[model samples]
Target: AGLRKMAQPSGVVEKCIVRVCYGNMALNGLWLGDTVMCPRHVIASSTTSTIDYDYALSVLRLHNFSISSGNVFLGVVGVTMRGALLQIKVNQNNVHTPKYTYRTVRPGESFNILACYDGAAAGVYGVNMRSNYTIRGSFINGAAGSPGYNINNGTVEFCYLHQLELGSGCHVGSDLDGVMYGGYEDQPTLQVEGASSLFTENVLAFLYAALINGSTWWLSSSRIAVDRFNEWAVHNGMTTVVNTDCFSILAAKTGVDVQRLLASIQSLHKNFGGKQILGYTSLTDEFTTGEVIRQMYG
Candidate 1:
């Protein structure tokens, strides 16, 4: 097989505004709050969804780099039809239904980060993207949402993250042209609110729950797992920074070590059964199961 080089992103990135629509129901924009408006290409997603063409992911890549976030106010305005609905999917598996929802960006501050989504129809929440951002370990590194989803690589004193919900399963991965990375499907979303310093904090929280509770704490139903993490934090004299309307955690963003982040990655590797992808078995595993069934039949 020939080795093909991945295509690099290029051109001037002007802004991070996401304009979405389906057959012109009056489009809307969603993006990081108060970005530097300049003469840059705006990442756009315009689609027409009928019964057959119902799902689509519009992607814009960075120019030979990745992005991250900090105190970012991410929001979405929705355009919907009679029965179909629209929603915003974040980097990683942070799918959210901002159904006329509100968040982040100070109480009295202008600019509302509205959310939207359509439920029903088998209801599977998966990301079928074709290489827009780098998957650093499991976290969606760089532009978390889209072309404007800024991957914070600069030094910052602190960060604020509100209404961030992280979940991951089988996303459409390359290296096999859709034969791999499990089959593709859209996903169900959770409505999330509250603020944090880093998006990775919530990711670490989920990983910790799986480490203790055996791999099922990915949903809001696992509320106790977050509570337990709070108790653990308090015992260590670290201020309790769990999810609440007004509760927010503060952290030093620059010069921090990557030990805990690495640990989280390693644990994720284990939870994936030592395979880079969970549930994808080796040819040996497949052969054994095949042989066992063959013997039974013979």
Candidate 2:
């Protein structure tokens, strides 16, 4: 969705001036009162001059604001004149279908999980078991009598699998299973005996609990999630890219080791089969200075 609405000023119309920054470019525009919609090409190609970039960075740094970028069709910037609240919304115009089966076990025949969803047994899974299947950063919700995933032979990590309103999670079928890490399940895991699946650091609560507990593991895990999602989106023919400037800025503000945090995220990306997207070789490659700024002066 694009920018929905901007709140009207109640008493005195306060004008909040903010330099809107995208990728490596900062627009020399002001957020007066209405919504400003910038096209994707304008944002992607806004890196023509370094003057705007430096000015944008100075403004953002002065106001302690960070830039966040995503692969989307448009960027909608809105500022409420009442409290001078700035809000940026990125809108994407793409829909993706999830893959139910990775590979078939039968010779000369292939089948998806659509059959499993139709009149199947109670423990039937929406995702069929297959070899070398890697499931990560996904939300799998099964029907009433069916479960979410069937991790019979592959890796299922960093995923949320559950049945509809039921507490049933994924099913570990065989002994050849790989590892499951940082997953969130509504109920306890379902595993077969002698199944050598390695389940570590999974949670039954919200993913944000790691942040509440002040865990470095959470920072890396969160970065992995975002990167994986961006990868999937890009693979599905969308123009999605991962930008972590906001994360880096926030981490530095909170006294966290910026270099270490980037290193940890990069290491996790490598370990988890994450690849570089949109020509961004590193996590900090999304923005040059002055890419995003928020300034308030009324």
Candidate 3:
């Protein structure tokens, strides 16, 4: 999705001002906020600057990165097998002609069977085949069946690749790919790092997590309020001063007066709020600063 919602450039006017504080409020272990900008040359040829997160309260703008429009897209691939006659059908229910009847066996020689979903949409694939065995030739691979398609990104729900096609020379129980006795013996796997064609639900989530987290810091706004409170505790003999998750027992003992601290915190926000902008120095870039502006206003 484009960072800005509007269609025309002239129609867009970006402006942002993050001012958060209950005149004097508090929270526990506040993670703070982040301000990010979209990448330049992300769509058109001309590169643009990043959004700016000016003002106070946004203290922990941890990391900043860039991303263009074309940089994001959905990709899902299929699995490929060798030495097996694999027939794949999708959502076909009838009583007459069928796509697959029995498993095709090639004696001791391995077979090649590879298939993939047509697109990213969700669907069920009918996998009818065998592992060169007449006795196990009539196995059914369906979305809601025994041999389920566990592949997350792809639509191949049910998979029944032999654990280890002893013919492939790859150790049966060893960390193996979907290879039987095919010609994958000498192929130098990325060695624990191989998996060039493999993907998982977590990885995709992690990938986007880092992006969005870095982009907007969960789209938050805060300041070093905890530390400010802690500083007040130092003079008041309140050792239990922390950013969050604390009790007022120390205040009870020292009689520092929580109401007084609240009032002081509020006054600081009004007086020194502008200077707190330094807390987000990590995001002081040309693009990110500009992007935050567009995101907040857009």
RMSD, one per candidate, in order: 21.9, 25.8, 29.4
Q: Per-residue lDDT for 1-298 in model 2, tens only?
A: 1111111221111111223454453421211223222111113233223223223333442122222222222344322111111233323221221222322131111111211121122222123222222211122322211112222223211121112121223332111111122221212234222222111111101111223234334244223344554454344322233344534443443454333443344354344344432223332211111111111101
Q: Indicate which candidate wins on lDDT.
A: 2
User: Which prediction has more favorable lDDT, 1 or 3?
Assistant: 1
True-vs-predicted CA distance for residue 109, candidate 3, Å: 27
Q: What does candidate 1's lDDT look like per residue over 139-186, in tens digits?
A: 122221222111112211111111112343212221101111122221
If scored against the real structure, what TM-score would every candidate get? 0.19, 0.17, 0.15
Worst 10 residues of 3 by lDDT: 10-19
Which candidate, 1 or 3, has the higher TM-score? Answer: 1
Q: What is the C-alpha lDDT of each candidate?
A: 0.23, 0.25, 0.22
Model 2: CA > 4 A from native = 1-116, 120-211, 217-241, 245-259, 267-298
Candidate 2 global Cα RMSD: 25.8
Model 3 lDDT at residue 41 = 13
Clashes of 2: 3
Worst 10 residues of 1 by lDDT: 117-126
